Tab-separated table of C-alpha atoms and ligand atoms in Angstrom:
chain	number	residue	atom	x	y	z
A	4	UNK	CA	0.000	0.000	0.000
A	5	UNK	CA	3.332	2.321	0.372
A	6	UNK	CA	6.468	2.522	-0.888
A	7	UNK	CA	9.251	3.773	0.386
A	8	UNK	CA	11.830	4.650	-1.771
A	9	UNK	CA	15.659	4.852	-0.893
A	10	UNK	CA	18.472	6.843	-2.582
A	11	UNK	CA	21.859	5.497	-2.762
A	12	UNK	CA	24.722	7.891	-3.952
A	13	UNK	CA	27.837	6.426	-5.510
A	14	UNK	CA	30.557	9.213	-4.366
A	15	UNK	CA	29.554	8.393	-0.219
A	16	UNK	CA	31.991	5.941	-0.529
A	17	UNK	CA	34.789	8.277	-0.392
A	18	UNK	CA	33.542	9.786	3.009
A	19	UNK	CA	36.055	9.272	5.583
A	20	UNK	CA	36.276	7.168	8.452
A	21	UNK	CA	31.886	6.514	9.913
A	22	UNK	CA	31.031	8.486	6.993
A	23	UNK	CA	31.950	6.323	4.044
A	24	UNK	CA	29.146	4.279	2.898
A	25	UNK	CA	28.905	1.191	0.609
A	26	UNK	CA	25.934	-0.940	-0.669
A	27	UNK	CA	26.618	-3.280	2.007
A	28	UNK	CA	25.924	-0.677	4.919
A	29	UNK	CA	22.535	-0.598	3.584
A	30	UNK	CA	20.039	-2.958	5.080
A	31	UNK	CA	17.679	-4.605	3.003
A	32	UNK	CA	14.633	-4.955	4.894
A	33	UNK	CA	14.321	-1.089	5.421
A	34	UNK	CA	13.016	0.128	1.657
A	35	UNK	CA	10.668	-1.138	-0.470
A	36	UNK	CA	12.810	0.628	-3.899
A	37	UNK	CA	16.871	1.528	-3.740
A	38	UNK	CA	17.718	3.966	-6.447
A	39	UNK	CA	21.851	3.974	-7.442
A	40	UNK	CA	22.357	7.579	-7.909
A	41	UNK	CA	23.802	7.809	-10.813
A	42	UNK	CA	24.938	6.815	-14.167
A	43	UNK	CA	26.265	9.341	-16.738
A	44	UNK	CA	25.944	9.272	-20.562
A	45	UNK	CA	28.366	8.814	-23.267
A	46	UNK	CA	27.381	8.802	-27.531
A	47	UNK	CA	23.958	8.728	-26.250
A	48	UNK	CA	24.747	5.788	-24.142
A	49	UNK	CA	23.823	4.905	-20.773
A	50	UNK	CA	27.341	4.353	-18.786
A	51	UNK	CA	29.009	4.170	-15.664
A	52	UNK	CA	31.074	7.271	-14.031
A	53	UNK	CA	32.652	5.489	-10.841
A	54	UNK	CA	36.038	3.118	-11.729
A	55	UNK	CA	34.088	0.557	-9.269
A	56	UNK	CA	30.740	0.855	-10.102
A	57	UNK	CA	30.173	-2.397	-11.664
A	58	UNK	CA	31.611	-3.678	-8.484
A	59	UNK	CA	29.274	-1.896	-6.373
A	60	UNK	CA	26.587	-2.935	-8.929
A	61	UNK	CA	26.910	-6.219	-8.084
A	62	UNK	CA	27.055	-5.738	-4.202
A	63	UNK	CA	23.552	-3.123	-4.934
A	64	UNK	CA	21.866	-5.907	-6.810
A	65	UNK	CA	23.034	-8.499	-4.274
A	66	UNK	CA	20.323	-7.002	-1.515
A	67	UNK	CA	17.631	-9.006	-3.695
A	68	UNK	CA	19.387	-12.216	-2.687
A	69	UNK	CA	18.232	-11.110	0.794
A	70	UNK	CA	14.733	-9.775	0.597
A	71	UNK	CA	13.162	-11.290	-2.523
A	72	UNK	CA	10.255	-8.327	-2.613
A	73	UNK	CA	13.112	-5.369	-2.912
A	74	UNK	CA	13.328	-3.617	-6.016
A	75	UNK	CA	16.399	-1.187	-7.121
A	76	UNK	CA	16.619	1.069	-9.877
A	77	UNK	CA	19.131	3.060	-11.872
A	78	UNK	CA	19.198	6.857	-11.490
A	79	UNK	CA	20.654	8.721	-14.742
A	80	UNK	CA	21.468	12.129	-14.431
A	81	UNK	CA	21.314	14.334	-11.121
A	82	UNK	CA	21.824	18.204	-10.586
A	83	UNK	CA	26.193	17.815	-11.857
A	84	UNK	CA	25.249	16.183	-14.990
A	85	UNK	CA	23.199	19.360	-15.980
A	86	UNK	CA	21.440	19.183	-19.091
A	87	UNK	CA	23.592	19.435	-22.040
A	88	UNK	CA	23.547	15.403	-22.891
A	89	UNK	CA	20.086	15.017	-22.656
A	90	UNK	CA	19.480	17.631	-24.744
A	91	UNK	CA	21.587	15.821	-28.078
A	92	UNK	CA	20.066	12.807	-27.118
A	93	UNK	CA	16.215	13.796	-27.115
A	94	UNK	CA	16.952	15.592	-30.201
A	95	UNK	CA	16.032	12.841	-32.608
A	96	UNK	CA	14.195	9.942	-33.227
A	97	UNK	CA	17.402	8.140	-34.042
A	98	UNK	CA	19.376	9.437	-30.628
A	99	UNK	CA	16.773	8.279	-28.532
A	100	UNK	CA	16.768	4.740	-30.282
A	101	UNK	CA	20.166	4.296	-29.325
A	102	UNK	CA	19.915	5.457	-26.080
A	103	UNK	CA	16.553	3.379	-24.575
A	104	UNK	CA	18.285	0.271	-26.363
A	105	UNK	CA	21.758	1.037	-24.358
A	106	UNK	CA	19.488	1.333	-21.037
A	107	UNK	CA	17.211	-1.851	-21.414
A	108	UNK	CA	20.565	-3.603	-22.620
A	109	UNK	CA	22.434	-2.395	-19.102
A	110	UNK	CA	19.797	-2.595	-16.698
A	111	UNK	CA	19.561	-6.525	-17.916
A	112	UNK	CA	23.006	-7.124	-17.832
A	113	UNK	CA	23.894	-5.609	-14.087
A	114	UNK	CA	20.102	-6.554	-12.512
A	115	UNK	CA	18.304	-3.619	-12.065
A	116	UNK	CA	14.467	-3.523	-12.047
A	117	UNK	CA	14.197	-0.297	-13.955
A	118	UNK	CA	15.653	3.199	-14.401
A	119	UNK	CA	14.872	6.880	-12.685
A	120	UNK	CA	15.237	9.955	-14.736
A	121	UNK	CA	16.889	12.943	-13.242
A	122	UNK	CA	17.272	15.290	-15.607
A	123	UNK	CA	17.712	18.970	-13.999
A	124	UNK	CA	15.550	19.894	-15.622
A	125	UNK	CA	14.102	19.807	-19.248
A	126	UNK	CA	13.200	23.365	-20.236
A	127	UNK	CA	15.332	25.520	-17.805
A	128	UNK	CA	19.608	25.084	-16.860
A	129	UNK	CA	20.302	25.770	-20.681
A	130	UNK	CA	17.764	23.190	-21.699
A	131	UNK	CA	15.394	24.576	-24.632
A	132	UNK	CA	11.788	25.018	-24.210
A	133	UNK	CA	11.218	21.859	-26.914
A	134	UNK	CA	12.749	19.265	-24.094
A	135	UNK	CA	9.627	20.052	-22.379
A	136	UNK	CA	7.568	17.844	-24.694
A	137	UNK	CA	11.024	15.764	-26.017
A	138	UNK	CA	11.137	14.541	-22.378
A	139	UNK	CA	7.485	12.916	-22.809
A	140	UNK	CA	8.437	11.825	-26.129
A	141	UNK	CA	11.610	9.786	-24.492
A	142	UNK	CA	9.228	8.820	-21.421
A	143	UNK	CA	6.904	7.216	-23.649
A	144	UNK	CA	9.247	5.539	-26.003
A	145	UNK	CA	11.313	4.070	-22.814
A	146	UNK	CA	8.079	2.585	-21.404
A	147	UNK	CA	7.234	1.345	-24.542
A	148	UNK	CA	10.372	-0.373	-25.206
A	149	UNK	CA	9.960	-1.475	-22.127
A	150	UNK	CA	6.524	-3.353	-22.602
A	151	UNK	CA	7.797	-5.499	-25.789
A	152	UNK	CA	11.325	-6.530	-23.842
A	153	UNK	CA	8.680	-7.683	-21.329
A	154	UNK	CA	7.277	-9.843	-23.545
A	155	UNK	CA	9.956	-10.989	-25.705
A	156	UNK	CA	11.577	-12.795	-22.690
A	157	UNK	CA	8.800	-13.079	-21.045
A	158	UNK	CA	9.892	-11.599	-17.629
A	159	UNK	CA	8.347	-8.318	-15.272
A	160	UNK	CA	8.943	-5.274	-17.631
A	161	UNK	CA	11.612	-3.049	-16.491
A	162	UNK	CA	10.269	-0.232	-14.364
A	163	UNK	CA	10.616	4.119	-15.361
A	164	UNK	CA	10.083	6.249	-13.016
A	165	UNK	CA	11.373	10.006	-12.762
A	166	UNK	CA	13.243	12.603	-9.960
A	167	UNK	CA	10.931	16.048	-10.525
A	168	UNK	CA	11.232	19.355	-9.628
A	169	UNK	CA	9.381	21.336	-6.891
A	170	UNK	CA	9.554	24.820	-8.128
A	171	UNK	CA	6.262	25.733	-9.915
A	172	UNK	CA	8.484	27.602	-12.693
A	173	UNK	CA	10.563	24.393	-12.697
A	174	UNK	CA	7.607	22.192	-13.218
A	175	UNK	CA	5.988	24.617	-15.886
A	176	UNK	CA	9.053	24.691	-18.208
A	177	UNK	CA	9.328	20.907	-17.431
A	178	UNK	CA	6.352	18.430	-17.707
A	179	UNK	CA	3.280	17.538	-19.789
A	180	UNK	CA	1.978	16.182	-16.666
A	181	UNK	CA	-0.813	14.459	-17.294
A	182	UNK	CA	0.773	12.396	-20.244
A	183	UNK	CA	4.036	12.107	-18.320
A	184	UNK	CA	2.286	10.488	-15.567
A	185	UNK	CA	0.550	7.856	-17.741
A	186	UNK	CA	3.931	6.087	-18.747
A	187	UNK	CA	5.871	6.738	-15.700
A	188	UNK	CA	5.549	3.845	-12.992
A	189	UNK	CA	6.170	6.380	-10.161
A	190	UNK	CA	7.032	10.246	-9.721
A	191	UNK	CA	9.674	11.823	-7.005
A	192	UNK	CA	8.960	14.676	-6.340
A	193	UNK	CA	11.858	16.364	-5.322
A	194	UNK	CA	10.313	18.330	-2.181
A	195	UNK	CA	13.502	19.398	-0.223
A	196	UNK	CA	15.825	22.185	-1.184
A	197	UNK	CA	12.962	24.724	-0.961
A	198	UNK	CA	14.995	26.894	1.065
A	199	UNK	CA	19.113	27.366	1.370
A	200	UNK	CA	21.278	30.275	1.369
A	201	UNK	CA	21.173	31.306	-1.860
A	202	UNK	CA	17.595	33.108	-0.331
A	203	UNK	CA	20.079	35.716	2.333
A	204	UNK	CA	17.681	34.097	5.133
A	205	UNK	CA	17.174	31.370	7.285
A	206	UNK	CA	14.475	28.967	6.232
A	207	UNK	CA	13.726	25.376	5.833
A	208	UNK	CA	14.711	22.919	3.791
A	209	UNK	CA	11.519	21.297	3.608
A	210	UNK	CA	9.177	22.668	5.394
A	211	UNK	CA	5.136	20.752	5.253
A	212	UNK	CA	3.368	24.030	5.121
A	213	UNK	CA	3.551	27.623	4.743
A	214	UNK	CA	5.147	30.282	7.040
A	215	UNK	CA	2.268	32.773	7.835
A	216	UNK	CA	4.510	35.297	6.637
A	217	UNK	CA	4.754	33.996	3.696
A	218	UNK	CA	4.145	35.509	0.539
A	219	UNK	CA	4.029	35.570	-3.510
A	220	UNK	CA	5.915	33.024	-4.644
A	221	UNK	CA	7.456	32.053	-1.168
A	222	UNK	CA	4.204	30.708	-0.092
A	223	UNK	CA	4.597	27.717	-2.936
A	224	UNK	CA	7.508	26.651	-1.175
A	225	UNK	CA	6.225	23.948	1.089
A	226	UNK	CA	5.903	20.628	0.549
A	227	UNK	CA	1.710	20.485	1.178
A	228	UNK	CA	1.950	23.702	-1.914
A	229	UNK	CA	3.896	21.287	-4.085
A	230	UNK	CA	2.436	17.983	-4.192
A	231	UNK	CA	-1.145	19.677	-4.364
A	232	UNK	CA	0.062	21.056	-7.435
A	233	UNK	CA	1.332	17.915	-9.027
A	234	UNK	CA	-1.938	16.057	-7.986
A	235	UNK	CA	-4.089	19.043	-8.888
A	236	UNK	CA	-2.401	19.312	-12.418
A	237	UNK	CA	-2.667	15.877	-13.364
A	238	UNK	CA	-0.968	13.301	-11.511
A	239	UNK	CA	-2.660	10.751	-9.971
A	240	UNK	CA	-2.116	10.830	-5.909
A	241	UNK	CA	-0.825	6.721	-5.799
A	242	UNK	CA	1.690	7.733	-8.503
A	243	UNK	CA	2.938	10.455	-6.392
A	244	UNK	CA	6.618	10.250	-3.736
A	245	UNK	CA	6.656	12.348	-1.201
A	246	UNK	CA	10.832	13.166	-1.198
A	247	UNK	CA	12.188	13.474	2.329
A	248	UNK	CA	15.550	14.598	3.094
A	249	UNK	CA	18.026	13.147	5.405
A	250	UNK	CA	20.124	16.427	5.268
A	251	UNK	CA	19.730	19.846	6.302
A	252	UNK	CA	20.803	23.660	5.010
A	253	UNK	CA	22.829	25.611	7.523
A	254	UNK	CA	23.618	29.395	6.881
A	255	UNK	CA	25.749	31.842	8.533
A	256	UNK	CA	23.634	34.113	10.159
A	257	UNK	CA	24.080	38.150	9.862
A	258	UNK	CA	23.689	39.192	13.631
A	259	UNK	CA	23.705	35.879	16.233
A	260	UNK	CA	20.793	37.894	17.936
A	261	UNK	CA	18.160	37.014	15.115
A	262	UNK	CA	17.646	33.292	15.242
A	263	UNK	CA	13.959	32.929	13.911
A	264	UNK	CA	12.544	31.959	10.717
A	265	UNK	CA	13.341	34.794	8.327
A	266	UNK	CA	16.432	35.982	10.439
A	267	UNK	CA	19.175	37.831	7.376
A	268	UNK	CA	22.364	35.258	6.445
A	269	UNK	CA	25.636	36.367	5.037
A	270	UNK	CA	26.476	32.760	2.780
A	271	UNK	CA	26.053	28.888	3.258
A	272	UNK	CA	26.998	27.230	6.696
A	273	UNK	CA	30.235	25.401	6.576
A	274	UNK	CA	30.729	22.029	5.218
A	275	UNK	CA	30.482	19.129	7.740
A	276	UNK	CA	33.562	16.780	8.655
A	277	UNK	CA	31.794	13.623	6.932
A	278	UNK	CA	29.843	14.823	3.690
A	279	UNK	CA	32.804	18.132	3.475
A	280	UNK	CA	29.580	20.171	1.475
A	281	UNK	CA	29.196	23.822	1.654
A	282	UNK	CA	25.467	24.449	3.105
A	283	UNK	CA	24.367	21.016	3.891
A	284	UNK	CA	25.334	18.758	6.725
A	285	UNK	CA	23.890	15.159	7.113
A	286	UNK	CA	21.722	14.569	9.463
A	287	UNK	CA	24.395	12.634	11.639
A	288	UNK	CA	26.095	15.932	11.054
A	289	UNK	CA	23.476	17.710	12.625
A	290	UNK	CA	23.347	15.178	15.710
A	291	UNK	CA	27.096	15.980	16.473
A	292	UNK	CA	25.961	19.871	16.590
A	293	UNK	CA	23.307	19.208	18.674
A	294	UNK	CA	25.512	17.327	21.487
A	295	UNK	CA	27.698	19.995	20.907
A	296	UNK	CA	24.829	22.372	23.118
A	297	UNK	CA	23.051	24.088	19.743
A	298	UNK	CA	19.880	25.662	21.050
A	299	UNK	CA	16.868	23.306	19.607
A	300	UNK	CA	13.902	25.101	17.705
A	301	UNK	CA	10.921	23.958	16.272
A	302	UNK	CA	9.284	25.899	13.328
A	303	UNK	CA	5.475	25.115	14.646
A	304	UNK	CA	3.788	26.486	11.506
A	305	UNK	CA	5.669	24.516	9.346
A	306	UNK	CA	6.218	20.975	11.815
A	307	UNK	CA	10.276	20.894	11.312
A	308	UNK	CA	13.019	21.263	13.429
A	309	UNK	CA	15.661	24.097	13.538
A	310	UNK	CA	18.809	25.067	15.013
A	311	UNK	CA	21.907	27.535	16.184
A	312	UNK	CA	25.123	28.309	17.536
A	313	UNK	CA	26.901	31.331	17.338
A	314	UNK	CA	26.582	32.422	14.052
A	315	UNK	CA	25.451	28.825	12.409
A	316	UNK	CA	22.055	27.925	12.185
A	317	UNK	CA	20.148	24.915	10.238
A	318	UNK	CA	17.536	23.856	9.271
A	319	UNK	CA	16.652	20.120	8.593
A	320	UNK	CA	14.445	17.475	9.799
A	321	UNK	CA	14.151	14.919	12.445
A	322	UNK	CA	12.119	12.057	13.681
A	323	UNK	CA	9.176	14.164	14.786
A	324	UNK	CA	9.105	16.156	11.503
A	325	UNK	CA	9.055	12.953	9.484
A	326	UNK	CA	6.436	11.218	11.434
A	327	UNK	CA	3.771	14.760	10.958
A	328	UNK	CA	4.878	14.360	6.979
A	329	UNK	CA	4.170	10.496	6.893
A	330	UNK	CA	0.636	10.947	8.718
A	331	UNK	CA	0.117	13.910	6.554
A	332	UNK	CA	0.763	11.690	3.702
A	333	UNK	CA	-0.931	8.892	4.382
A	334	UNK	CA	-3.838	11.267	5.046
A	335	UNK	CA	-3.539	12.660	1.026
A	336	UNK	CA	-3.513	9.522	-0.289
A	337	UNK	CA	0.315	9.712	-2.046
A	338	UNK	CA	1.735	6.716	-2.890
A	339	UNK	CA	4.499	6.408	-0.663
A	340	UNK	CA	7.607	8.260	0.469
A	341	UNK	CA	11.324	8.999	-1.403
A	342	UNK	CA	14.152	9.926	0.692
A	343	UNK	CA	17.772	11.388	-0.133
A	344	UNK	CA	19.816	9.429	1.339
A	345	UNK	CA	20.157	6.458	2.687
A	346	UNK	CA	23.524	7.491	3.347
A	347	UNK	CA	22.982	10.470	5.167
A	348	UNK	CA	20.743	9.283	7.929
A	349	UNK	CA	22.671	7.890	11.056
A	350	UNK	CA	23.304	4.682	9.434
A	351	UNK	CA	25.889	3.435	11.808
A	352	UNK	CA	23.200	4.519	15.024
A	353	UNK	CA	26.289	5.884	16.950
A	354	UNK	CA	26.055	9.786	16.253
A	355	UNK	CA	22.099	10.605	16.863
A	356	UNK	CA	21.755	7.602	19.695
A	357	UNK	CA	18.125	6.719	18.018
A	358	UNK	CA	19.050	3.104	16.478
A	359	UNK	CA	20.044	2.747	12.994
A	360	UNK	CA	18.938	4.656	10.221
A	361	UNK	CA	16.617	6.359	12.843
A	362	UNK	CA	14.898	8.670	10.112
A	363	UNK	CA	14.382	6.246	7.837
A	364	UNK	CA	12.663	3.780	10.372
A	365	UNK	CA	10.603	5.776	11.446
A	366	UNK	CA	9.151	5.985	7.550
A	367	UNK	CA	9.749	2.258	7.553
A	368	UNK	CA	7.108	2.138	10.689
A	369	UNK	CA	4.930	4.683	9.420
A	370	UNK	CA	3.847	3.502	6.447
A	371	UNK	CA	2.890	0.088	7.866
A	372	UNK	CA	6.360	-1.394	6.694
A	373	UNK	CA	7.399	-2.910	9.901
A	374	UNK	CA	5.600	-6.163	8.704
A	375	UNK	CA	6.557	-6.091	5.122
A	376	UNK	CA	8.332	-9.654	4.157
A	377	UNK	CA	12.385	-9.880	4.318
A	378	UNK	CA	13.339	-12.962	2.814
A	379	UNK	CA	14.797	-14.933	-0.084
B	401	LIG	C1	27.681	12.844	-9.626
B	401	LIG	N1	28.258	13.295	-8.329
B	401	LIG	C2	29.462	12.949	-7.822
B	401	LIG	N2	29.664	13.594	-6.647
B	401	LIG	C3	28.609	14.329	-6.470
B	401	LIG	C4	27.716	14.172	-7.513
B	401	LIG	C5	26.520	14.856	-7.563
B	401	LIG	O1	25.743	14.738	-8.516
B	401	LIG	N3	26.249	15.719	-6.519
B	401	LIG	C6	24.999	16.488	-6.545
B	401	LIG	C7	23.779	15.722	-6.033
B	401	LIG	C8	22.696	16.803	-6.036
B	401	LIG	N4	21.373	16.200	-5.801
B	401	LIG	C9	20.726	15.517	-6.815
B	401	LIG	O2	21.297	15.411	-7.949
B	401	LIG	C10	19.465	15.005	-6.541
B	401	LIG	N5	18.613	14.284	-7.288
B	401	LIG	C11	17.537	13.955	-6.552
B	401	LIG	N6	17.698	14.500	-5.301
B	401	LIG	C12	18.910	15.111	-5.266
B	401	LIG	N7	19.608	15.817	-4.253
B	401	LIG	C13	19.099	16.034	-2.843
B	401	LIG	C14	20.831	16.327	-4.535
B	401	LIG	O3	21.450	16.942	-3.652
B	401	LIG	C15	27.165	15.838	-5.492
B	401	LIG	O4	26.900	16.550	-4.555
B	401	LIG	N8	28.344	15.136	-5.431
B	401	LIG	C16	29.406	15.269	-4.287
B	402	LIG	C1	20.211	21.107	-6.006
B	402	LIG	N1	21.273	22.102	-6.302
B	402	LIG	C2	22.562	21.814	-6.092
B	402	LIG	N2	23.290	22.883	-6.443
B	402	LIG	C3	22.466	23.838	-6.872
B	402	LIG	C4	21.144	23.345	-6.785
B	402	LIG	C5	20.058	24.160	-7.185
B	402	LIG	O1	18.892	23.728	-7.113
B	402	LIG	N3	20.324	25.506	-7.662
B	402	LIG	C6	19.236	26.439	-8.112
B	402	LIG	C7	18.179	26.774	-7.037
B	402	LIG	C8	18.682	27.679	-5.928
B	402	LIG	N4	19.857	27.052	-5.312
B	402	LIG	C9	19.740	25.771	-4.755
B	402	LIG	O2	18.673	25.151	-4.770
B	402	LIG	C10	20.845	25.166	-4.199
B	402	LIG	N5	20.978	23.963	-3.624
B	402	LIG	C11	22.264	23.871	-3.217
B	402	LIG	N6	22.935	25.004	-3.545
B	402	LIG	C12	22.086	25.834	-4.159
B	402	LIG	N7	22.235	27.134	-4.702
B	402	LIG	C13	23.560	27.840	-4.651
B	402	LIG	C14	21.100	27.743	-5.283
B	402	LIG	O3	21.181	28.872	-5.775
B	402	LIG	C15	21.679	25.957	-7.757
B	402	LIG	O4	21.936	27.084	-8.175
B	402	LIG	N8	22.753	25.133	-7.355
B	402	LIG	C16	24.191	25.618	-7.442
């Protein structure tokens, strides 16, 4: 009746020390769908961009021989990749041909159940406004495709499902909706990143609802805003993944007075000893700075969890904050929930002190997993 949907990223492995995470660390009774984020593209081909990734492959794959119900997929694209190649390769009937035969050819041959489309994002990042309804073209070809390999070696077809943007000028320059949704098996919405520093305030990085200040175009930036939209617009509710991060934003704030929602920031927060990014710190990040005696808030309008020291603050999410968006989901009817990343929740249990992968168990018990079969 749920899914829950996991994202693996291929560069954690070169986190250092508790950080680094492998296919291995990931257990396999905790999603219902692992995503391998990513491949690249070459000649219009579907390829690898790690040296080990047919190693890990193989190890990502290998989960099925421990919970016979898990399905995985292969994510192409992602924000780094940009545009640029899936731009030549939409751009004819020809391209495309080469392409969805290089994917159903690679998924087979490594074990994956199916491919996720990231592309960031047809119609804006230099992509012209004729991706828009190339992307739906490629969509429906790939499913397609799909369908007769099905039945030309008679096994489950291959799954498609796509990573979509939140911002309503994102998704306008982006999707035929309705059509998009009637060849993609699922649709992940990418509901985190709605706020950063990039704003020059503090605010969330996925906030459920609204601020009450809030307004224009800031009051679409909530995840109840943005997966109305998609539903109202033309995508059915079951096809629709609620994205939940595992990460937070943390800014440097302009006076150390102002700590609210709203407060003025003069750049990103610094990077984190484990994930070393500007702006973002993993959640098991975040549980260090909290034992380091940051003052706790909670936004109340908008059910998440903030924070601050000196000049740092951060916004992110925690067990409480996921629970209110998996009732609220449940509630709406969505189909089920997509998180980034497996390997930024406290995998190893020993920063946060709330079990292993605390965030993502409490999805896991949410969404009526905890029963859900785990065996060969
Ligand atoms: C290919 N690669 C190798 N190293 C990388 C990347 C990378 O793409 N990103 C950007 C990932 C950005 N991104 C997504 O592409 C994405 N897609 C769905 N959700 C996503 N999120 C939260 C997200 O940060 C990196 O940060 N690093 C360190
Ligand atoms: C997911 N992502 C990763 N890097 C990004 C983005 C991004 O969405 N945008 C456009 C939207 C506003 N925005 C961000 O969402 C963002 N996320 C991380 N860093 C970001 N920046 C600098 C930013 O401007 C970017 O410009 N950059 C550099």
């Amino acid at each position: 009746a749920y899914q829950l949907t996991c994202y693996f990223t291929n560069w954690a492995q070169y986190r250092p020390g508790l950080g680094r995470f492998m296919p291995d660390d990931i257990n396999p009774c905790l999603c219902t769908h692992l995503i391998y984020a990513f491949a690249g593209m070459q000649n219009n081909e579907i390829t690898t961009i790690e040296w080990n990734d047919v190693t890990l492959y193989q190890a990502f794959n290998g989960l099925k021989n421990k919970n016979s119900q898990l399905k995985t997929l292969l994510a192409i694209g992602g924000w780094n990749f940009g545009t640029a190649p899936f731009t030549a390769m939409v751009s004819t009937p020809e391209n495309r041909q080469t392409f969805i035969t290089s994917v159903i050819k690679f998924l087979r041959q490594y074990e994956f159940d199916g491919l996720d489309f990231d592309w960031e994002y047809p119609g804006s990042r230099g992509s012209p406004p004729q991706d828009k309804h190339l992307f739906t073209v490629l969509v429906q070809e790939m499913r397609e495709a799909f369908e007769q390999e099905a039945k030309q070696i008679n096994k489950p077809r291959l799954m498609v499902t796509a990573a979509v943007a939140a911002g309503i000028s994102n998704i306008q320059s982006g999707y035929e909706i309705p059509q998009l949704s009637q060849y993609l098996d699922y649709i992940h919405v990418m509901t985190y990143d709605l706020h950063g520093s990039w704003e020059g305030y503090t605010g969330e990085n996925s906030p459920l609802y609204k601020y009450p200040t809030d307004t224009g175009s800031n009051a679409y930036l909530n995840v109840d805003y943005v997966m109305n939209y998609w539903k109202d617009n033309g995508a059915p509710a079951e096809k629709l993944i609620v994205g939940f991060p595992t990460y937070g934003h943390n800014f440097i704030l302009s006076n150390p007075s102002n700590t609210g929602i709203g407060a003025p920031t003069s750049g990103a927060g610094p990077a984190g000893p484990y994930a070393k990014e500007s702006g973002i710190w993993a959640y098991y990040e975040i549980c260090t700075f909290l034992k380091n005696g940051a003052t706790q808030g909670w936004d109340a309008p908008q059910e998440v969890p903030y924070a601050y020291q000196g000049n740092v603050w951060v916004g992110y999410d925690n067990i409480k904050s996921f629970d209110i968006k998996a009732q609220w989901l449940k509630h709406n009817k969505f189909g089920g929930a997509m998180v980034w990343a497996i390997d930024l929740d406290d995998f190893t249990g020993t920063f946060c002190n709330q079990g292993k992968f605390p965030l993502i168990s409490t999805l896991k018990k949410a969404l009526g997993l905890q029963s859900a079969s785990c065996t060969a």
